[PDB]
Amino acid sequence: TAIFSDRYKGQRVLGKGSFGEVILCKDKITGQECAVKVISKVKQKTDKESLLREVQLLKQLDHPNIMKLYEFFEDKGYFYLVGEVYTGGELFDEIISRKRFSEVDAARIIRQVLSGITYMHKNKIVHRDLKPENLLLESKSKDANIRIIDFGLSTHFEAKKMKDKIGTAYYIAPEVLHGTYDEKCDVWSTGVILYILLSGCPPFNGANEYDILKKVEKGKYTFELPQWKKVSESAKDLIRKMLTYVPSMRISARDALDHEWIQTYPSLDNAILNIRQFQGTQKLAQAALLYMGSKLTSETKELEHEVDVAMDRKTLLSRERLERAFRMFDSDNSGKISSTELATIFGVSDVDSETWKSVLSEVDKNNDGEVDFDEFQQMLLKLCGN
Numbered sequence: 001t002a003i004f005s006d007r008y009k010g011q012r013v014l015g016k017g018s019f020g021e022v023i024l025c026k027d028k029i030t031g032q033e034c035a036v037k038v039i040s041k042v043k044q045k046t047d048k049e050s051l052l053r054e055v056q057l058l059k060q061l062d063h064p065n066i067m068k069l070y071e072f073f074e075d076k077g078y079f080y081l082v083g084e085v086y087t088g089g090e091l092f093d094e095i096i097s098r099k100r101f102s103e104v105d106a107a108r109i110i111r112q113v114l115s116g117i118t119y120m121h122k123n124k125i126v127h128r129d130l131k132p133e134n135l136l137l138e139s140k141s142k143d144a145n146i147r148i149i150d151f152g153l154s155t156h157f158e159a160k161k162m163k164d165k166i167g168t169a170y171y172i173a174p175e176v177l178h179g180t181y182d183e184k185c186d187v188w189s190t191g192v193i194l195y196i197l198l199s200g201c202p203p204f205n206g207a208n209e210y211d212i213l214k215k216v217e218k219g220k221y222t223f224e225l226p227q228w229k230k231v232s233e234s235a236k237d238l239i240r241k242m243l244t245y246v247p248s249m250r251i252s253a254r255d256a257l258d259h260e261w262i263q264t265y266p267s268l269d270n271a272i273l274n275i276r277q278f279q280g281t282q283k284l285a286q287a288a289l290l291y292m293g294s295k296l297t298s299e300t301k302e303l304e305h306e307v308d309v310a311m312d313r314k315t316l317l318s319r320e321r322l323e324r325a326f327r328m329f330d331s332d333n334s335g336k337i338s339s340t341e342l343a344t345i346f347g348v349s350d351v352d353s354e355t356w357k358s359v360l361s362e363v364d365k366n367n368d369g370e371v372d373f374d375e376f377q378q379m380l381l382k383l384c385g386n
């Protein structure tokens, strides 16, 4: 009968993760800091006996590229995953800040990723949801080791809410979609990510979730973009073997390490330009949805002090998370995003093309297919019952 609260005190929110929010916390005794994910009792997809056993297994595994899990707590309405803190943020968010990115840098990234994977598979743990946000860097620098997050989480939890579940279709193996899968799906995911690092472009793309899924399920892609000239044929080989449709024919994680490209390994300015566009788009569609979530959550109809109808305070604080992602997406500092850029943004956030366009004419009848930030804000609000 272990109580989470009798051990840990919350500090600041660290972000959101799969299945719940991530809260930085501190041991009331030893002062050690930890990242707690809280899973709001989300449906357990297996026995409540299958969980503790896997959790138990996970507590004992150790790899420089795998997140360390320290403790598991459950009360009547929640699950608490107490783990380690990694401060260097997500891989991609870093790379976009780089000014040079090369084939050797990507290889050094992937080789990390394949290490954790291989180790986990030896121990028969599948990830299934491997994606950029589940790759955090240990420290601030640009040669810090990568930790894979949530490895093992999804054999036990389900998910739906487009707020979350965002940016995931690019990476899921076709076989995951049809229901029959094994550890080979984590190899397929890695290939998508390898591909994106060498091109700035997902191998399977589209205007919304379903059309991406359709590309994935059909499973065909090309190197017929400009960006692939500078990219060696050794890499394209590895990519090919990892993005091999039938899982049994697909190359294992172990063997991806012994591949010529990894063992072996200019600059790729195009990939960086593209990867920046991808991250910003991703980051802004997310913010756009969080914002709409925050706006509904107030409730102010249910009517650490910090008292010292002050909802106005927490609306300005949400305006500027949105605004930050807007500014960061507007990289030419024009102040405006085009209707085209809108179509893309509302696409990955699954707002009906006809829905926002209508809302847009409600906000300002005389726009010529560009919105400033305030107009964008006005649109989102109207898209959420405001």
Ligand SMILES: Nc1nc(-c2cccc(Cl)c2)c(-c2ccc3ncccc3n2)s1
Pocket: 014, 015, 016, 017, 018, 022, 035, 036, 037, 069, 081, 082, 083, 084, 085, 086, 087, 134, 136, 149, 150
């Ligand atoms: N999807 C995510 N799940 C977690 C998570 C957190 C604790 C336990 C478990 Cl099982 C998972 C994340 C995490 C992990 C470390 C972090 N360290 C610094 C900042 C954010 C962090 N976020 S992201």
